[PDB]
Design a protein around this ligand. Structure first.
Ligand SMILES: Nc1nc2c(ncn2[C@@H]2O[C@H](COP(=O)(O)OP(=O)(O)OP(=O)(O)O)[C@@H](O)[C@H]2O)c(=O)[nH]1
Ligand SMILES: Nc1nc2c(ncn2[C@@H]2O[C@H](COP(=O)(O)OP(=O)(O)O)[C@@H](O)[C@H]2O)c(=O)[nH]1
Ligand SMILES: Nc1nc2c(ncn2[C@@H]2O[C@H](COP(=O)(O)OP(=O)(O)O)[C@@H](O)[C@H]2O)c(=O)[nH]1
Ligand SMILES: [Mg+2]
Lengths: 49, 442, 298, 430, 430
């Protein structure tokens, strides 16, 4: 029976790995959003000039 | 045969989820209350009766109430996976919390809710024919657990009288802390709990964290691990009622054997084969190894060292494949040891129990699967050290009346602090006096 | 210098950009095709998108207004200057930087056939972690300005990512796009309509009398009057779609969202399998013929 | 358990507009008022801040008050402005003149009956009322005078509920108005009796947050109001989502205030990360605890190193271990033990909530009760006394009708508040 | 067991950039920061120098400090510069002026708190901290003054850890600056108190290595910094890979220093050989030991033949027999017996590590404690005394605020260090 216990543990390990990949993608997305904000500000200044 | 469980507040409801998860998986009732069985003969299986009653349609329902003052946790129970198991009346919720104030639970708000609770307990007790106690799970650090737990235990104690009340209690840890006002609530709780409980089992979260770090291989434990461990302990203690065995032990035998004098009812709890699945194939698990394990201070679920005191009585519960001769040989070997000492007025220090059903393995659980286990509850004078540090922290806060205006404004006389602190001081003196060897007084 | 593969890419861009057979390209094509959103400085966020137009004018107009266009040699030496400026760049690697910056700025490669949207990941690959939860947008090509002007109509957050875009026919892959893929081209926004949270079916045909569908990917809040005729023809309510004879359903998978899950959900995990096994064990013990671990009830 | 919001004056209405944008986004409410969320968890506590209109619609439990309609017309013209109920906008016909006495005595008594009528109409619709939330500046004119008037009336009418305030107080350096000391002193006098808990923010501290931590090149009031809306929406997060260790505004108040006058708190919010250094640091409990106590991230000019912590509270959002929280709070208290008041054995309360703010894996909001707050009040009192001795602008206020005795009473009361903070600040083991 | 690197001043930043290139190459870290290695042995000790940032990435545990950003902008522009965490770069707004007193008293005390805050934040993150590693030049301005200031502060805050320094010191032959003697004398005075173990390198020795051994026609500072990065990465190599006879910085210090003031060591590295010559000679333990002890290959101007070895240490990298090492060290000690101090029965410690630097079958690094190091300090002291009698440039330092008494103290302390080394040299006894 302890064999099957180990198998279920392995499945849980894979699931948490997937969650970690998700969170990394989210961090990259937020960096992109900040870059877009800076882009808009520079465009407005150029139009003024 | 049957027992009814009362869960109060946040810790008590969350521990209840783990308990009923375990009891369902151990008996085999489906999450919707069903119980599949493919054989037409051999239905005569009354063991569920301790915790469930069946309807005329054959659905099973469990003998529990859930009590909380905030809605969120019980509404989480209402929407979860076990929605269909409980009758919706059993899940009781108030409007607003006791805000970590014992005074709000006891005086203002619990007096309104308490009569509904008593009506529910009556509704349970009417569907009974041999009730032999209540099991209560709570923490004394929070407001509703302290105030409503005391009020409810007082009312239960007047109405039902002699019937036994067994408490599993989470006390504020000696240096881990979650809220500032913990000492006041714990002192005031302990004052009520002294008069109105038959056995009280003490737990500290700091000990279960240490045990889960050292023995299990969990770097970042959370409350679900502790609650699953507590559920396993309760299942071990109640297994003696539910399955066949060589030496059975009824719940009244614990109180008769463990409690020498009527105030001395606080007991320590420990569990032996806490081991991981990878470790489990490296070790044999004989009777003597697990018997030696329950006595190591690394095994305790409360942060006290029993080497700083004297044992008065021990109750040893063995479950699984054990033979009585091995239990006797183990207990005699323990008795030989020099770091284990008994008070000279207690020559026959041990009670044994032996049950054939091995502990159940829970699909998400962290304990390994093992063929045998032993669980110990013991009464020892070392606990007096636990109260003294709480008393010092209370004295430190009360010397400047640091928060008292909330409690006095919500309705309590200032005198009640001094009364409770003097009564717990007398309990400390009782534990000092009981432990003095009679050969010294001649 | 430029490697031969970069020369091939430049040749392909010039030829695909060249209308007619004449070896000249209008400056309007240069302006329309060039992609500012893939400019390195703009992507990192330290230059304004309108500054690229002035640079293009400064490099190209002097010969564009004189010879009526740009030949191949001026384009090639423009990219030679590009490489020379990228040589002193801050990036660790130089060849890949030049290659993918050329690909990004000149909009070459593989694009989804309608509305010409660049895919983020290969279309045949199932969606990964984050993109399995973020809602997608409904997009179609405008008609008052012809295709190739890169102006589209957009409705935000009306498509679930539960399906894979590789199963759709090649002429409908570009109808659904992610928010990150809309950067670099003009957008016109449309307004939703008040409705409840219902999910709606998408159907189409691949042969006369044969239909294929994907179940429940369109929100019921898409307002049908704003959409063109064909696009609202392909959207139909679920049971009506079910009643259509000889319909096939594209496989869809729903993925958990790790932003909205609780701690108490950990308790009831894997319990039906264990309880089934326990019931089998207990009935086997009751029937007899059990010699190891046996049930010890009453 | 529903909260009613009141927004007063220009600063209050501007902060409120961003707050209701942030809250509507977090619960997925479209600016038309329609629910567009993607989990039942969003819907099941929407009642806490929204009222239900017939079939779908949600309305935000807020009253907007101002003395000149310029701000209300600006918020109505904004992208979410339509959501607000039209009858909830209260305005007069002539300005406060940046004068406390006008806002309190002349236009105040004229409008005040209509605001109490609207708040009671809004309050009595709730099935059970939790505290009120008020945003205003103390340096202004209608904000200070009419805000404190309304606070006093609500404390008369609802003494058993909770009263919570967020308040902006003038920096000594970024002077936008000459008469700031009078308005601040009179408002602090009103607050120490009426309020249950008051949080104070310096605009200079928000500028230092933006420039040093976020390194923004060209900040605007939208950023400052976003920081404020972030903390405001964080304090209530445990009210409206499940968690492993629930907490509540009343439990925070009970654990933070040792004695009833000591109810002024500092605020901070931890996971602020710079625009170009996000790939370099993963979120973790050590990172949040280290950033959370860094004075760069605290929203007042006084620094904790010049005072001592009586109590602190941390509210964590996300799926995380309790062990890491308890052991971090123990380690920080033990290693820096001289900065914690010694007659309390444990000064920090923790709370844990499952649902983080959108787009962050984890966040914490920090509330601290620290004696260094006395430095702000002392500075305001010095500036007030310097002008009052010579009567620098007093004829405006006296012409409205104030007795000069009010200024000496208000000065004495503020000086006693400073003294009460000072005695606990400088105690030592003797 | 975690090491913290500090790179200070222009020399420090350049050596650090080349060192972190060599270490990142040896552990297979891409310049994007992604692990791309091909054996678990590479991964299993990455923690020693790198912290793990989210989704794969590793960041190097180093603080970069300088007073004018020109160098810092140059290192950020280099091929590996992106790997470094932006917050770890500390710079001011005006230069050291090549003046020790400015670097120590005026800009030092102004900047030092932000460096100590970063170093403490970084140190307290380790689960168990091993010693610090310090790189700086003594001839510069900010390097000498602020480096020794920071070293003194770290010795106050972490006295139980190890403090290790690599230091570049001027030359009488190829100086870049006139006021070198003051900065060198004051820095050596600070170092002899603060440091636990210090290695000294002359640029003249690196030029002779490059020109004579490698036969480069036109060497550049990149070659000198490669030689330094090779020895620096070699001393710690046994800390972070398995071996038959493990060694550690603390074990080296305990075996090399007989008495606590005698902690200045000479360095060499053996498998140096020109691309033309490499086809002519295979690697073997006799060849490495012979090259290792040849004075041509040692990185100081002083020659061992003019002094005596108190103690020495050799760290071997590669798969090799213990028999060859022990018998070689015995044979060298027995055959040249007049050059070894007689009251120690065995002066050499050996250590063996399995994993060589990439592309070499075997290598050894040598650390030697020899009294001929006294000749360098005496020479610097001579030039200082020549300059000081005439007050040649003293008004700059006195104008910063220094008392002249510091100069006489620093001269006396350096003279006593030279005397102590000379006394232990004492050729013969009686
Ligand atoms: N073992 C365990 N302990 C818990 C759990 N939740 C809270 N505690 C502990 O119990 C004490 C807090 O008590 P609570 O249950 O939160 O108090 P309450 O019953 O909710 O009372 P109110 O706050 O007034 O609603 C602290 O010592 C916590 O460490 C839990 O899930 N498991
Ligand atoms: N942080 C912040 N401060 C503001 C904002 N608007 C005004 N202030 C400040 O508040 C003070 C002016 O008070 P004001 O709100 O105009 O008073 P009122 O006229 O009574 O509404 C000045 O110190 C302004 O800098 C805002 O949107 N955000
Ligand atoms: N070996 C070596 N020496 C250097 C390097 N850079 C500068 N130096 C020497 O260090 C001295 C100049 O010190 P510098 O680093 O500029 O001091 P700083 O201005 O405080 O940083 C001169 O003797 C230079 O020859 C280098 O990369 N390698
Ligand atoms: Mg509670």
């Amino acid at each position: 029976a302890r064999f099957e216990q180990l198998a279920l543990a392995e499945r849980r390990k894979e699931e948490q790995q997937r969650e970690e990949e998700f969170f990394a993608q989210q961090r990259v997305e937020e960096n992109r959003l900040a870059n877009e904000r800076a882009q808009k500000d520079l465009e407005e200044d150029y139009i003024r000039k | 045969r049957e027992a009814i469980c009362i869960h109060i507040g946040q810790a008590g409801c969350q521990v209840g989820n783990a308990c009923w998860e375990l009891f369902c998986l151990e008996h085999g009732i489906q999450p919707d209350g069903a119980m599949p069985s493919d054989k037409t003969i051999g239905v005569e299986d009354d063991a569920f009766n301790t915790f469930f009653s069946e309807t005329g349609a054959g659905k099973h329902v469990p003998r529990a109430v859930f009590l909380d003052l905030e809605p969120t946790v019980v509404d989480e129970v209402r929407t979860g996976t076990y929605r269909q198991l409980f009758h919706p009346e059993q899940l009781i919720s108030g409007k607003e919390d006791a805000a970590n104030n014992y005074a709000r639970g006891h005086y203002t708000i619990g007096k309104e809710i308490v009569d509904l609770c008593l009506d529910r307990i009556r509704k349970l007790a009417d569907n009974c024919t041999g009730l032999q106690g209540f099991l209560v799970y709570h923490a004394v650090g929070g407001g509703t657990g302290s105030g409503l737990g005391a009020l409810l235990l007082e009312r239960l104690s007047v109405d039902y009288g002699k019937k036994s009340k067994l408490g599993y209690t989470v006390y504020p840890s000696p240096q881990v802390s979650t809220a500032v006002v913990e000492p006041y609530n714990s002192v005031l709780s302990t004052h009520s709990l002294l008069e109105h409980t038959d056995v009280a089992a003490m737990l500290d979260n700091e000990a279960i964290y240490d045990l889960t770090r050292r023995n299990l291989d969990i770097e970042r434990p959370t409350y679900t691990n502790l609650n699953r461990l507590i559920g396993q302990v309760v299942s071990s203690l109640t297994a003696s009622l539910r399955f066949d065995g060589a030496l059975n032990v009824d719940l009244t035998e614990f109180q008769t054997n463990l409690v020498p004098y009527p105030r001395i009812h606080f007991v320590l709890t420990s569990y032996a084969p806490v081991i991981s699945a990878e470790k489990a194939y490296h070790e044999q698990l004989s009777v003597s190894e697990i018997s030696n394990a329950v006595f190591e201070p690394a095994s305790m679920m409360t942060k006290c060292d029993p080497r700083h005191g004297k044992y008065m009585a021990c109750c040893l519960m063995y479950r699984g494949d054990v033979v009585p001769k091995d239990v006797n040989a183990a207990v005699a070997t323990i008795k030989t040891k020099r770091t284990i000492q008994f008070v000279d007025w207690s020559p026959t220090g041990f009670k044994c129990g032996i049950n054939y059903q091995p502990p159940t393995v829970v699909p998400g659980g962290d304990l390994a699967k093992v063929q045998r286990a032993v669980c110990m509850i013991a009464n020892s004078t070392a606990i007096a050290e636990v109260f003294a540090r709480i008393d010092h922290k209370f004295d430190l806060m009360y010397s400047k009346r640091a928060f008292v205006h909330w409690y006095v404004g919500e309705g309590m006389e200032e005198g009640e602090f001094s009364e409770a602190r003097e009564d717990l001081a007398a309990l400390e003196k009782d534990y000092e006096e009981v432990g003095a060897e009679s050969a010294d007084m001649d | 210098m430029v490697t031969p593969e970069q020369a091939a890419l430049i040749e392909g861009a010039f030829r695909s950009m060249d209308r007619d057979g004449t070896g000249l390209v209008r400056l309007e094509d240069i302006f329309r095709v060039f992609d500012d959103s893939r400019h390195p400085r703009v992507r990192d966020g330290e230059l304004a998108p309108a500054a690229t137009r002035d640079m293009l004018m400064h490099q190209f107009g002097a010969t564009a207004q004189a010879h009526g266009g740009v030949s191949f040699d001026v384009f090639m030496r423009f990219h030679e200057r590009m490489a020379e400026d990228a040589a002193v760049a801050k990036v660790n690697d130089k060849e890949l930087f030049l290659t993918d910056t050329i690909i990004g700025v000149w909009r070459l490669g593989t694009l989804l056939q309608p509305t010409l949207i660049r895919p983020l990941f290969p279309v045949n690959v199932r969606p990964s972690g984050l993109y399995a939860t973020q809602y997608m947008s409904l997009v179609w090509v405008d008609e008052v300005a012809g295709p190739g002007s890169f102006v589209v109509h957009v409705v935000r957050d009306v498509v679930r990512p539960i399906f894979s875009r590789g199963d759709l026919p090649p002429q409908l892959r570009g109808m659904f796009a992610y928010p990150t893929e809309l950067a670099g081209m003009k957008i016109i926004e449309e307004r939703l309509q008040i409705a409840t949270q219902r999910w709606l079916d998408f159907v189409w045909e691949y042969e006369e009398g044969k239909h294929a569908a994907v179940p429940g990917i369109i929100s019921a809040r898409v307002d049908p009057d704003t959409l063109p005729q064909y696009l609202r023809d392909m959207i139909v309510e679920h049971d009506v779609a079910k009643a259509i004879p000889s319909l096939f359903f594209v496989p869809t998978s729903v993925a958990v969202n790790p932003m909205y899950k609780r701690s108490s959900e950990e308790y009831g995990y894997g319990v039906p399998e264990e309880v089934k096994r326990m019931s089998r064990w207990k009935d086997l013990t009751y029937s007899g013929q059990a010699c190891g671990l046996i049930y010890h009830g009453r | 358990r529903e909260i009613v919001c009141v927004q007063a004056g220009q600063c209050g209405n501007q902060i409120g507009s961003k707050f209701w944008e942030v809250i509507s986004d977090e619960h997925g409410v479209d600016p038309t008022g329609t629910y567009q969320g993607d989990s039942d968890l969003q819907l099941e506590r929407i009642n806490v801040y929204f009222d239900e209109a017939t079939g779908g619609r949600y309305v935000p439990r807020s009253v907007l008050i101002d003395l000149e309609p310029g701000t209300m017309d600006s918020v109505r013209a904004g992208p979410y402005g339509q959501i607000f109920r039209p009858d909830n906008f209260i305005f007069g016909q002539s300005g406060a003149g940046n004068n406390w006495a006008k806002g309190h005595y002349t236009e105040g008594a004229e409008l005040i009956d209509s605001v109490l009528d609207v708040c009671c109409k809004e309050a009595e619709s709730c099935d059970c009322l939790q505290g009120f939330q008020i945003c205003h500046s103390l340096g202004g004119g209608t904000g200070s005078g009419m805000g404190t008037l309304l606070i006093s009336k609500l404390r008369e009418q609802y003494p058993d509920r909770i009263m919570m305030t967020f308040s902006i107080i003038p920096s000594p350096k970024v002077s936008d108005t000459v008469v700031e000391p009078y308005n601040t002193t009179l408002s602090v006098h009103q607050l120490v009796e009426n309020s249950d808990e008051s949080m104070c923010i310096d605009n200079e501290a928000l500028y230092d947050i933006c420039f040093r931590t976020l390194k923004l090149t060209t900040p605007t009031f939208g950023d400052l109001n976003h920081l404020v809306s972030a903390v405001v929406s964080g304090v209530t997060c445990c009210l409206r989502f499940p968690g492993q260790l629930n907490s509540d505004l009343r439990k925070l108040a009970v654990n933070l205030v040792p004695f009833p006058r000591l109810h002024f708190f500092m605020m901070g919010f931890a996971p602020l990360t710079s625009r170009g250094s996000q790939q370099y640091r993963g979120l973790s409990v050590p990172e949040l605890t280290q950033q959370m106590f860094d004075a760069k991230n605290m929203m007042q000019a006084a620094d904790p190193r010049h005072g001592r912590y009586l109590t602190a509270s941390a509210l964590f959002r996300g799926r995380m271990s309790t062990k890491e929280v308890d052991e971090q709070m123990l380690n920080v208290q033990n290693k820096n033990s001289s900065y914690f008041i010694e007659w309390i054995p444990n000064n920090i309360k923790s709370s844990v909530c499952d649902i983080p703010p959108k787009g962050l894996k984890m966040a914490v909001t920090f509330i601290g009760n620290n004696t260094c707050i006395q430095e702000m009040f002392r500075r305001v009192g010095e500036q007030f006394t310097l002008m009052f001795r010579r009567k620098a602008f007093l004829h405006w206020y006296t012409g409205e009708g104030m007795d000069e005795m009010e200024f000496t009473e208000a000065e004495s009361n503020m000086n006693d508040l400073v003294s009460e903070y000072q005695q606990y600040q400088d105690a030592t083991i003797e």
